[PDB]
Amino acid sequence: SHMWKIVFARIDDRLIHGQVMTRWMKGFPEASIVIIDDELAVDEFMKNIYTMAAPPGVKVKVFGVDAALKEWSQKTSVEEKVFLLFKNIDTCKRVMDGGLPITTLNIGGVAKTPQRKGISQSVSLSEDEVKTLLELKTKYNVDVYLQMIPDSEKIHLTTVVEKYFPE
């Protein structure tokens, strides 16, 4: 089997913050958190911050994109359950384009910028970003939805397009 079994994937530009991941990990009891980000992979200060902020009893590992693809590609007799955490859509696209199978993609946090349209308190998206999410759905059959925490409002990608980007 592949080294990792991907139990969930989430995009949140603030990664491990507050109690958010403690809430998410309760749904994935045996999983570790794997953050895939090229910037964080070399940033020792923030690697320590996020490791310290991790839910009690949950391992955190950080990989760059190429290293994540290399690790996942390895075969093993005992797979590790992993909850993938990305800072941004582009990094997720790069790993999916590299063959890493993601089945569900939760958009958790994307900060407002002038180029993005506000959708929720936690998520704003540009038209280009929504086009990218649609492309991931089309190419890879990923189920994409916005949801901040497990018990908060869930908005599917199709609903996002219909209400916020009619086109």
The contacts of residue 81 (CB under 8 Å, 6+ apart) are: 4, 5, 7, 28, 30, 31, 32
What is residue 38's DSSP assignment?
A: H
Q: Which of 17, 26, 59, 156 is catalytic?
A: 17
> Is 7 within 8 Å of 28 (Cβ atoms)?
yes
CA 98 vs. chain centroid, Å, equals: 16
Q: Which residue reads 């059959």 in tokens?
A: 141
Pairing of strands 80-86, 124-125: unpaired
φ, ψ at 55 (rounded to 5°): -60, 145
Q: Which residues pair with 81 in a beta bridge?
A: 5
CATH code of the domain covering residue 145: 3.40.35.10
Question: For the packed helices 127-140 and 157-164, what is the interaxial angle rounded to 10 degrees?
Answer: 150
CB atoms within 10 A of CB 38: 16
- Number of domains the chain contains: 1
Does residue 2 carry a catalytic annotation? no
Task: Write out the two tokens for 41.
Answer: 């992979």
Integer angstrom CA distances of residue 149 from 58, 65, 109: 17, 25, 10
The contacts of residue 15 (CB under 8 Å, 6+ apart) are: 35, 37, 40, 50, 85, 87
Residue range of the domain that includes 16: 1-167
Measured CA to CA, the distance from residue 112 to residue 120 in angstroms comes to 10
Task: Write out the two tokens for 27.
Answer: 């749904």
